[PDB]
């Protein structure tokens, strides 16, 4: 009958190599929720400008960095898939600020979920399992309305954001609690 | 000062004077002071002082610490004394917020070194930590935590272009205010009034 208040939703659509998907994810994304995670709600969806094929029964994916970002979406779609959400955002984060990403896999993972082996997320990333969560990242990505024009594509609440750097404030103002954290008085306008 | 015809606009000063075991140092570092950073570190000249409310005293020629949150603290406070200076400073800043957001610590000093320093043994930071080398990085973190002018009244002690800070949820604005460039990281046009 008195619910609290709903968090703030935001998705991000990326790919694991796209420049300016990564800068948002570290350096927007990432600091923002550490800001107000209390009033956040992220979702993460690793395929940006992939494309798809069924090739004799089996999804095949092409990626527009190469090989190596099509495994790395695949790596962090199983990161998504087995650790707590928390434990996931933090290990991709750490990976995606890193010069070799793939080669960072055990060290982040030794870090934020040490009970989880980097040879586990890597039999998920090249096995069935992986190629499964990337088809369904692919067919979320395809359903986007409107179709995304670039990535990172933001999604605020599901609306499109168009400038990054505004993410924090709109969450800020966006958020329906009158008790706001204490950031988001300090920035208010 | 340089390079001294048409100088860039400097970068605002924040200095942390924290214990490593309190709780309002490691909120505030972790989700203040870091967060910040990465939103406008090309703006931020940022300084730790792991020391907070230790106390100092020379017994028998040799300089020995109490810590408020027991030996443990002690020890963490010099570990991490000791990477701010084994390592370089962005790499001593990632690995010390790395540990500090951690529930146990000092197990997480190899994992989070293997990240951000891989090429720094968790062996030898250790042994500087317990040696004679993390003794003096102390006792000079007791003599700059000493000499706060004026003297701190709690921890987290934050300056801010030498000034106490006394709301640190003002610490994004703020260092977006006091930068006196006019090209500003675009979060700054964001948040501005
Ligand atoms: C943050 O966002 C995610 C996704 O929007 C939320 O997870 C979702 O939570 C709802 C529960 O309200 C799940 O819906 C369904 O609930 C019924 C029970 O009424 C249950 O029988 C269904 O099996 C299903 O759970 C929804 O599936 C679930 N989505 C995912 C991907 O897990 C999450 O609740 C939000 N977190 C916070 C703190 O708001
Ligand atoms: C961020 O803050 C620190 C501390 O204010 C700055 O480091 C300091 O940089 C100056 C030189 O830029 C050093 O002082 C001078 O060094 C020269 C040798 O280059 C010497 O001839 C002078 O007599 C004087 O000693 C100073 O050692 C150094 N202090 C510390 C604690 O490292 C740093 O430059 C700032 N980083 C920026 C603005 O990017
Ligand atoms: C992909 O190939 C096989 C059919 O041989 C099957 O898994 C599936 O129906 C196909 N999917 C599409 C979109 O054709
Ligand atoms: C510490 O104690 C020694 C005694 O061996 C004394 O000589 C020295 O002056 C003291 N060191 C200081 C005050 O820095």
């Known amino acids: 009958p008195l619910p609290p208040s709903p968090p703030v939703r ?4 990326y790919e694991s190599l796209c420049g300016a998907c990564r800068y948002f994810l570290v350096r927007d994304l990432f600091p923002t929720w550490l800001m107000v995670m209390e009033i956040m709600n992220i979702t993460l969806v690793p395929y940006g400008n992939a494309q798809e094929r069924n090739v004799s029964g089996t999804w095949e994916f092409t990626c527009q960095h190469g090989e ?5 979406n695949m790596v962090e779609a199983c990161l998504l898939d087995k650790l707590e959400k928390e434990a996931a955002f933090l290990t991709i984060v750490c990976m995606e600020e890193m010069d070799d990403m793939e080669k960072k896999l055990g060290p982040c993972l030794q870090v934020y979920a040490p009970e989880v082996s980097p040879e586990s997320i890597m039999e998920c990333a090249t096995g069935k399992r992986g190629t499964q969560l990337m088809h369904e990242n692919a067919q979320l990505t395809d359903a986007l309305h409107p179709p995304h024009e670039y990535v990172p594509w933001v999604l605020v609440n599901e609306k499109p954001l168009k400038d990054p750097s505004e993410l924090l404030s709109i969450v800020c103002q966006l958020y329906q609690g009158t008790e706001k954290p204490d950031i988001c008085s300090s920035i208010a306008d």
């Open 10 to 13: 935001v998705s991000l659509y």
């Open 68 to 72: 190596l970002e099509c495994r790395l």
